[PDB]
Amino acid sequence: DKMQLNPESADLRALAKHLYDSYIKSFPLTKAKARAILTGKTTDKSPFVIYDMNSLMMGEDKIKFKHIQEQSKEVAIRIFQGCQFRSVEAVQEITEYAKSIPGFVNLDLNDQVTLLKYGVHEIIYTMLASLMNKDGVLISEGQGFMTREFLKSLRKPFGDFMEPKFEFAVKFNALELDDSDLAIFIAVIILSGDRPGLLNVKPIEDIQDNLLQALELQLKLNHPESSQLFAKLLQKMTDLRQIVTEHVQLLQVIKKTET
C-alpha cells in the first residue's frame, strides 16, 4: 500500500527519536511525567493545591513563584508576574531545543531569531496543555497546582487571562498526544515559512516538509484509532495563533488602565 519499512521511513523514525531525546533534555517536566502527577499515578509527595485565597496565602509559605520577592503585594498581578517569569525561562528551553533541530543552526542567524520570536508563544501554550486538566494547571515545576476556577475568580482583566488556554487544552488533550508526537509538532511550529521578515524561506520550508513527513508517520504509527489526526493537529496551529492574538489584546488593557 503506502506505509512500508524502506530506508526513507527509517530516517523519519530516526528523526523522531532524535527530536524526542532532545525534547527530554531541553524540557524538564514532560507530559508523561506531568500526567502521572495529575492522575496521582506517582508518589512525588502529593504537591500542594491552591484552590482559594486561603490556600494561596498559606501555600506561599513554601518556595513558589516568589523567587527573587517583595514585588506586587497584590495577588492578581503577582500571579501574572509568575507566568511571565517562567515564560522567559521557557524561551531559553525552547531555544535550546531548536538548536537540536537538524538544519536550524545552519540557517541565517537572523532567521533563527525570527522563527523563535513568533514561535515561542504558540509552543508555550502547546506545552502548557500537558500540565493542565479540567481542574487546573501544574505550577512551580509540578510542586503546585492552581485550579482553573481560582484563576477565573480573579479581577476582570486577569480572570479571563488563563481561561482561553484551558479551553484550548481541553480539546487539545482530548487528542491524547504523547511526548513523541509533541516533539515533532513543536519542531514544525518553529520551522514556519510564513513568519514575518524571513530572509530565506525555502530552506526553512525544506526542513518543515521533512518534519511534516516525520510527524505524519509518527501519528499514523502511534494513533491507529484517530484517523486524520495529522490533519487535525495542523488545524490546531490555527487555534494557537488566536490564543496569541487574545493574549496581545489582553496586554492592550494593561497599557490602557493599569498604572
Binding site: V88, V91, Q92, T95, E96, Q112, V113, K117
Partner: peptide, 12 residues
C-alpha cells in the same frame, strides 16, 4: 531584553 536579546543570548 524584549524577547529578542533573550533569544539572541541563548543563540550563542
Amino acid at each position: 531584553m524584549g524577547l529578542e536579546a533573550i533569544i539572541r543570548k541563548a543563540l550563542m
